[PDB]
Design a protein around this ligand. Structure first.
Ligand SMILES: *[C@@H]1O[C@H](CO)[C@@H](O)[C@H](O)[C@H]1NC(C)=O
Ligand SMILES: *[C@@H]1O[C@H](CO)[C@@H](O)[C@H](O)[C@H]1NC(C)=O
Ligand SMILES: *[C@@H]1O[C@H](CO)[C@@H](O)[C@H](O)[C@H]1NC(C)=O
Ligand SMILES: *[C@@H]1O[C@H](CO)[C@@H](O)[C@H](O)[C@H]1NC(C)=O
Ligand SMILES: *[C@@H]1O[C@H](CO)[C@@H](O)[C@H](O)[C@H]1NC(C)=O
Ligand SMILES: *[C@@H]1O[C@H](CO)[C@@H](O)[C@H](O)[C@H]1NC(C)=O
Lengths: 225, 232
């Protein structure tokens, strides 16, 4: 009876006897090139000569890339303040797509969104063209001054956003608009935004998010709401 | 000097004092939805507040997918049966592309001459090649279907591979029924690294501009069985 080598990189590799009706050994090679990169994967497994039917997935056309950065000056501040351990990666698959952050099955895309203040940065770009995908998303530390200045805070009207705590900051990159965002107990941020953000906002990450923008330096000052 | 968390997936995780002038701790979260799949990555590291330059890549626009599948029915035959070990995965990067004669590797500067956009299929009795070239995000989301998922399209071609004395003689040449869009009979004769020969079912694209065998010589016809040896 028929035994094949069962092996793929980062896997439990063994010789295995196959199930009945698995009559073929297989070597698979996937070579993939994009953006000057060449990936080459090999997988060896049993397999079958029978044709077997399989569903085809919903070709969405859209790839959504979302970035969030947080910075601080104090020691060890990027340590997580949880009791338990921190997530560093996560694969999530929506199995509806194989038949049988939005949940559509059976948005203000394409475009980019941007926001930042003195110590946090959120960028989101969704693309239906290949060039859009190949572009990298630049973090705060690589965006130059744009001549705009806006006010920055986050927190209650008494903790996080209060005359002491709100500072004027020099905007960077395409975030050449000033922004306020109101939401939820009451909670608020100020910072530089892209004009894109002011139309379709998506942030922390509160609800009943109320957003307004103005396009002159300093104009998101508190005594202007 | 300031000590921050340095940690990431498949990374060396620790607390480290940062280099001078790196006055900030950082936490970065990248969520990435694509083809019904949500991937998120977190990175904690040092960084700095002064803006510092970084170049962007030449965005090529193309994604070349390539599936290759080889089968046999004999015990332990997907053994690579060489003395030395075998490559399960390999990543290559062209450093030029970060702002630092090709086919199908690439030449950035013998440049931008594929004839690609589209797909190229070929199979024979026991091997299968398919080359999906992409220009839009929708052809990417199309998976490449293994031979076990292809119906028979009605065409029949002859099939061999190897020397004209060993592997591609009337003795070793068998008719096979093609599957999928591989509705053309093909012979190709190239070279290894003497003369090489291969016959199989291929696609019309495979016959126009496609490869993947040096000094490739390809000929295609579309009547079942017409890639028979004594027809060349
Ligand atoms: C899918 O598979 C079923 C049974 O396995 C078969 O009746 C049907 O015709 C197949 N459809 C296609 C398009 O191959
Ligand atoms: C992307 O979507 C827009 C609609 O907003 C459409 O006009 C355009 O043709 C699409 N591009 C691609 C490459 O699908
Ligand atoms: C908002 O106010 C309450 C009480 O006034 C306080 O306990 C809480 O910490 C404040 N919010 C933040 C984010 O500090
Ligand atoms: C990169 O830095 C150089 C000098 O270091 C500067 O002249 C240039 O303007 C910077 N890049 C851009 C795109 O401005
Ligand atoms: C793909 O490239 C071709 C040029 O060969 C062009 O006609 C087409 O619009 C491109 N599609 C996209 C989505 O860029
Ligand atoms: C045909 O090729 C084989 C290798 O597959 C080689 O060993 C053999 O000598 C060749 N036959 C000739 C040159 O007649």
């Amino acid at each position: 009876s028929l035994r094949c080598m069962q092996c793929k990189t980062n896997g439990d590799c063994r010789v295995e006897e196959c199930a009945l009706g698995q009559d073929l050994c297989r070597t698979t090679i996937v070579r993939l090139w994009e953006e000057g990169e060449e990936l080459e994967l090999v997988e060896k497994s049993c397999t079958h000569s029978e044709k077997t039917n399989r569903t085809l997935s919903y070709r969405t056309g859209l790839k959504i890339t979302s970035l969030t950065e947080v910075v601080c000056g104090l020691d060890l501040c990027n340590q997580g303040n949880s009791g338990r351990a921190v997530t560093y990666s996560r694969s999530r698959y929506l199995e509806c797509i194989s038949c049988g952050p939005e949940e559509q099955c059976l948005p203000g895309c394409p475009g980019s969104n941007g926001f930042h203040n003195n110590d946090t940065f959120h960028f989101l770009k969704c693309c239906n063209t290949t060039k859009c995908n190949e572009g990298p998303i630049l973090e705060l530390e690589n965006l130059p001054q744009n001549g705009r200045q806006c006010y920055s805070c986050k927190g209650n009207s008494t903790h996080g956003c209060s005359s002491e705590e709100t500072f004027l900051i020099d905007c960077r990159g395409p975030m050449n608009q000033c922004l306020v965002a109101t939401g939820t107990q009451s909670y608020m941020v100020r910072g530089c935004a892209t004009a894109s953000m002011c139309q379709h906002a998506h942030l922390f990450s509160m609800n009943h998010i109320d957003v307004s923008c103005c396009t002159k330096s300093g104009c998101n000052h508190p005594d202007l709401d």
